[PDB]
Amino acid sequence: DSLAPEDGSHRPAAEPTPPGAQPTAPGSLKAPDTRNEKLNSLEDVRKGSENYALTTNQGVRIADDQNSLRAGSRGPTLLEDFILREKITHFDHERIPERIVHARGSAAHGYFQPYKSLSDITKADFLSDPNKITPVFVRFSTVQGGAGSADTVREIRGFATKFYTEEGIFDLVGNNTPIFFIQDAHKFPDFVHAVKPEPHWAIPQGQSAHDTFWDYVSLQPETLHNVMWAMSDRGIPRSYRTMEGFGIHTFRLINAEGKATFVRFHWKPLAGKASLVWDEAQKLTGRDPDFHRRELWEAIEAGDFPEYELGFQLIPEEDEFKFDFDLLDPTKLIPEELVPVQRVGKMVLNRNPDNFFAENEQAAFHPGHIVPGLDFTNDPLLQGRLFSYTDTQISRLGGPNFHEIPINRPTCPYHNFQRDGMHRMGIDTNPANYEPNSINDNWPRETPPGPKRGGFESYQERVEGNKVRERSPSFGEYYSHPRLFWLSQTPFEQRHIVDGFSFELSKVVRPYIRERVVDQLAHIDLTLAQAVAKNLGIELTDDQLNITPPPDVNGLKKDPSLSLYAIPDGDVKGRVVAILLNDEVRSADLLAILKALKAKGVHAKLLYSRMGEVTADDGTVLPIAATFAGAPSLTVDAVIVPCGNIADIADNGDANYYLMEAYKHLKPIALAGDARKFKATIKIADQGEEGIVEADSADGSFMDELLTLMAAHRVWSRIPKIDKIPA
Amino acid sequence: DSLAPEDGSHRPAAEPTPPGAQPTAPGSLKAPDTRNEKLNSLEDVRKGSENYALTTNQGVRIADDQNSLRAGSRGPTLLEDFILREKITHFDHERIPERIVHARGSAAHGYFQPYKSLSDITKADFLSDPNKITPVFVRFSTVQGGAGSADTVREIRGFATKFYTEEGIFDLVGNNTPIFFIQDAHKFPDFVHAVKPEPHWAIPQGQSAHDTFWDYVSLQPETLHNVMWAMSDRGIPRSYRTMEGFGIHTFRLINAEGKATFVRFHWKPLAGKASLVWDEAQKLTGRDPDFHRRELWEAIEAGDFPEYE
Amino acid sequence: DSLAPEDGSHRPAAEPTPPGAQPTAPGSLKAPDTRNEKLNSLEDVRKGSENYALTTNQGVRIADDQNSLRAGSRGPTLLEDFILREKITHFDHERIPERIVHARGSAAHGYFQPYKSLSDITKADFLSDPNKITPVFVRFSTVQGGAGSADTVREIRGFATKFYTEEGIFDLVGNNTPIFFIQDAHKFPDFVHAVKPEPHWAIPQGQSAHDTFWDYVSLQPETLHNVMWAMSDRGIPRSYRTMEGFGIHTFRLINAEGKATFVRFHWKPLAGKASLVWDEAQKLTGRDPDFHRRELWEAIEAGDFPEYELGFQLIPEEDEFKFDFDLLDPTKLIPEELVPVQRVGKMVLNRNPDNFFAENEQAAFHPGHIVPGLDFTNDPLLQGRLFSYTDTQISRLGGPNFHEIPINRPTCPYHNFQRDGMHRMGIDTNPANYEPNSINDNWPRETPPGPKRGGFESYQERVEGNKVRERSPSFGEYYSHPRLFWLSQTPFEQRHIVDGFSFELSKVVRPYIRERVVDQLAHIDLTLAQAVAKNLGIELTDDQLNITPPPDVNGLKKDPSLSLYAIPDGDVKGRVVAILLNDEVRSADLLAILKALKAKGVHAKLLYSRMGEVTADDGTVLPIAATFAGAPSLTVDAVIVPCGNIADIADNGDANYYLMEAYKHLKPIALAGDARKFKATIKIADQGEEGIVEADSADGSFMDELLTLMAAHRVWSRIPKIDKIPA
Amino acid sequence: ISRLGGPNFHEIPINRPTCPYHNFQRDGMHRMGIDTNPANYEPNSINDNWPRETPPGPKRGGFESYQERVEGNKVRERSPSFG
Amino acid sequence: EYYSHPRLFWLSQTPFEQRHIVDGFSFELSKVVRPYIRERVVDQLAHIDLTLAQAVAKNLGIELTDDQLNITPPPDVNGLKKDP
């Protein structure tokens, strides 16, 4: 019609902008100059809109898209209205089956590059030269919940990376913890059914806090290691940018000489490790169920590209049996104190998709998609995964041509004798559709294995044994890994683990299941078992009190790489601060605050009791981003209150509760000038307390002290003080 | 191995119990004596479990459901393991496309009966006799969110009833407000796309609080009436038991003489009308996203059967 | 490798060659410089093969495409063999549901061009200028059989044309007869189920000759007009190039002033009308079930492009009720004597597809696909069709994005707010997916109807009446059109119709059905009724002999344009002759023979009792195309036997049968020199017979005679004589 | 999965076993059977682990594969004995 | 006609239900990033009821224009000023 506003404010600038500054938009319109080989190859299917006539799918221009064709303007709709029927038919069949697991996920485009050639240990082309750039598409996810469930639940997270290499797609399909819950893929449907919503009523969504999960866990002790990780703060990451990624399974690297090296894949977050606290995560599932999806997308639009370092744990073939645990058991981690992670390369996620459905929802990742230079192992969970991810896309993506959906297509050549199938896009001109043929001189042809550009050949591992449905005896140990994890955590991390188990078991209706899990915990660590038992009103028996603790893992009594926080790895860039405004802010405080945050890449959101604008003491007009209730403290990392007319918000329930909530959740709070009158809201001593920044003005060291607190993420020393507090 | 506790406390007593007194269970096990013609007719496909062997779908008993078939106990999985492949194949194809709209919903079985014969205004068989009962199956829902989204969002709610009558199925597919947002069905995809999560990033879930919805409303003043109802406390009902239901459209009733009467359908909640307050409703989407689903299920297990006039 | 023969004889020349001179090939390899806008736009999805490596669909090169991965070379296949699983998975899902009706069909690409601008009667862009070339894709088909059924069955044929216009796809979905069997689309499932294989045992394939079909016809007299056409030789076309096409329904042309003109669409074969005879057609279903598909493909490879003239019957809106039939009744034809066909343009089919499945099997045509300048009418059969052809593709082609399958894509712009759906190819960048919107300034936008490039607006026909499920009383006449058709046929065409009814009804097991059908024939024409009755051993009653014949159609007692052969229109270019060789052929006969055929564009196939070659009297080495049994007379239009050593084949039973079969099927036979010894096997008098060319040698007079016979297609005067030929 | 529309093709009448079939598989397109088991996983205590595994035996026993000896490298190779 | 039914609904609500309607609109429009959309919706509320339009505008920091303050309320629905 010409409905947009004449000032052109309906459209976001095509330049990096902080979260909340402009309306978000499709990647290619937001960052048109951000390109890569894969992004460029999708140009054949990108569709624009501006200046085009509205049509049917058959290209017929529509004159009136506001009405159905009827006999009389109040008459019946006619069957001949093909414009209406096409438009409703397409709407009526928009949905496709969601992923069986990991249905909730958020994705982005980026690129990877190795630091140096790894040709001595692998012939994989994407790892052969530091100047070879490989486009990637990454999808992060939860596990149990549907595609419409919430982001900040307590659960493992998926981390899947599609590498578009010159010798084929390589999908590295991992999670955010270094082990899985079960050992053999045959039990995957039992474990998943137990964690998913129960079958009679389909409750609960996005939560393992229910009877069937804890029933299965209590009967299958192999699950305890990953359950410990889920009950820790690892289960509630602050962002997909601040969590680790792992392939879990031991795979193989194969070099040109045919030597095999065992390898476990790692991703290290260059923004550091950081998690929420349970009350915050749970409440944030209501206040903003799309918090992680939102934070990922906004980070990329702001230029805070998610960056990860790919690393390898490498173990020589001859050391297969040198550890206390089996290398092929996916419920066991390889302690970094035993086998260090070797830095391999960096991945940078720097562009959002254009259309979520087309690129995110239809993407298909599968761990069987490997390339020459990589190979599998006999890990029994990985072995069964190889069957499932090709199988499942026959219903999810409608057929066997899912590699032809734009986001999934290889950027390297693909040619073979496969034909037809639903939705076939490629029109083959080969005279032959079989080999061997003479009618096309046998093309396309097989290629012998070789150092570069050769055909895939499996490593000739020796296989010896009878055909058995049997778990290796070497996998029958379930408590030392859980115990190593427990002992590696800080005291506040241990408390959060105890609280996670306590909260989840309190939602288990059948008391005997609680009792049975507590008995399993007594096989891991007595302190942990006693603390959870106490919270459940359960007393350990004398037998439980004397269960001997599992042995150390290869002599280790702890490994600090297992803790999120034991070793500081703080990074403030991309964090966000709530600034609580008043109707006459001291502009000098705000100038100091905003400029210090901007110099460190820390975002801010100006909050007030209404929307619109407020005018500072010097006449500066301040645009309000959101109200106190509209953008709760759950969404920020720290809270700053500048001086001015504090009487304006001193008695505002929301403004006070904002600080109580952030204080409860261990976030740094800074109060300037008269804003120190809020100290009584959070009961802060006159002398002050570690974790609260306070001064006569926001000058001098006020912002540096606040930023130091943000670098340590949360104020763990405040835990004992929050215990009480009615918030 | 892994067996029921000695005391029998793993299984819910089959009698009406208050919320939280017993673990919830499938209806036919919770209330085996509760019947109606539709519930009885579903007996051909109900499948039990106690005392039966674990099998493949082809009926072959399974000896070891804990392991894949491999060459050696630390060896590769064999392709001949058909037990594993059937089991994982069925898991791999569990999901079906969710509803385009109203994908999140909660349902129950029940029955309907007219107060008196309505034969003077309609020849419909299910409304012809006060002592002639008609089985029903009712689904309550939200509109925008996926099947895994939260219950206590701010939104219109669906209220659909399937009447299994002697002369055919009658579905009364209504909502909890007496009007809809738009006038012509040709605009349905435009309105639904405007309220659904935005196409670039698929945010936000279960919320009309976002630019495209208010853009559409601002350009299409026909939407204001139902938007008023959604912004009121009608948009955040306390329970599915405590909201009204309406067919919205004028339909016709046709009697045996051929006379047509225009009719609009209503459901009155005999538990009364009651809604949450916003702060409560929004926080409850995070503390218990399945609150309405749970509340309906438990009211029926407790004997507080949802009743509507 | 190198399996191709060193001489390069595995690959067909990329130049026009006669049927059987080279192996057939994908269209783009056979005729790479035959281009059109649609063919060029498919280049993005065409995939080659030569010189490429064999890969998985994920782009991974394969080393050994001959073996599965196993533990030991006689061991069990491993689940980790992803190369095997991908290849078998694709194979396992190659098939898609066939079309409900018209599953058997053969297709080609071409182009259309108008003879003059039709802007005075229609604003349809493709008809606006003689220099506007519109790419087309045409699929010809039978109706009842599966996709694997035979071509030369007795049945109506489908003739579907997809026009890729600059203002949208226009599909003209018609048949080879001018009416349909039923009046309202609500009965289509009943008619179709009655003609299809019966439900208990799924017999018979590709045949109406069974009880349920004749049961339905006997109880629904509206079907009799199309049944008459099916029982005539119209039901057994010689080739898709030699049949007419009709849209059947009255549609509307709309001009720039908004005036509506009723129109019926026609396709006139520029190669002339020609049909087989029943025994030849039925036997040809067994000797070559692919005969019509082959004939179409090979005509195009030879440069005998199928050409049709588009024709319109135009009736002013004010003449709606001036006929004695209803213009909206699809069981009624508009006699060309009353309303002439205006010649409007030409369509030429000049290129075969590259991949049958991708382009033919997946093509989707629908009569509802119209463009501005065209509109529907209330014909109750066309009205219901409008719902079906969009609905059926949701299962057949897997979803609502079937317009994105390459062959179905418009070549003109298409932009709208529809999104998602299974296998979504297009990646939309529009910030908005709804209208009205302000965030993209309401694009893509609606367009007002107009003279050119305007949006679609339906013609504002007045609708008055009650909502009823009622047949118009004006459609209640069922015998006058059938009679008009009958009286328009030649005496031998009449005899063939009698023979068609008689043969089909003999296969009806319930005698009462045969009698009820004969009763219907008595309401059409007594002579027809009596002759069919006599072949069934049925006696017309007193009452049936006195049924008054239906009235003439608007004064007509016949219309020669309804006959296949009444008005000469034959064309020999593209026809084929079988030449029966001996071991010492009179080379002078062959030269005269082949020089004369080549001047008329008539092909030849050289046959012998074995493959390889024979050597003529002068030493010319003649290559053999097929044996006498290998390429039966059914597959050729005429038979020529040159002199030489007749003794060699004079006692060859296959050689004698070849002539007896061709004789019986009314084909021209030419005998030179001692080839005249074969007159005894087909019992031809010493003085000769019209239809048999004989002479001392094969000079130019002999060939002109033979080519004259071939232009008249068949020797109809020989019918009375074939009775006594045991063949 | 494509020919018969999904993983519940054993529920199409002609394919149905005449002997008992019980397991923990659920859902899928056109699911006919309505499972009443409180549990859809094993091991479970909430339904006392039913339906239960059965050891192999002379009659009515669970399926156990014959324990054939496997020995060799992981190869894509045709046995020479087949040539 | 788009405003009389909205108005009938508004006037039939109790004072605390009216406040909750105001709060619902205020909360939802505060999450609309583009300010002109908020303004356009406030303009539509001014065609329904000025008390409602002003209470929402106040929470959005918007000031109604003089023209908006003079929009005539829609007619009653068949004489009804409210329906409990």
Ligand code: HDD
């Ligand atoms: C045998 C079945 C099986 C097993 C044992 C696993 N999963 Fe899996 N997973 C699948 C069956 C599967 C799946 C049904 O095939 C899925 C869902 C839909 C899809 O495309 O893949 C899937 C999705 C899937 C995703 C989502 C990819 C995306 O974003 O689309 C990730 C991140 C994981 N899984 C990761 C893992 C890890 C790290 C595993 C253990 C080490 C694990 N899975 C075990």
Ligand code: HDD
């Ligand atoms: C109400 C349904 C109905 C009606 C009354 C008819 N058809 Fe039809 N026909 C269809 C329902 C259909 C179909 C179910 O929708 C099909 C099969 C699959 C599809 O794509 O289209 C089809 C295909 C189809 C084809 C094959 C298109 C191709 O090559 O793919 C042609 C030539 C015809 N039809 C022509 C006719 C004619 C000239 C009709 C009467 C005048 C007739 N149809 C009436």
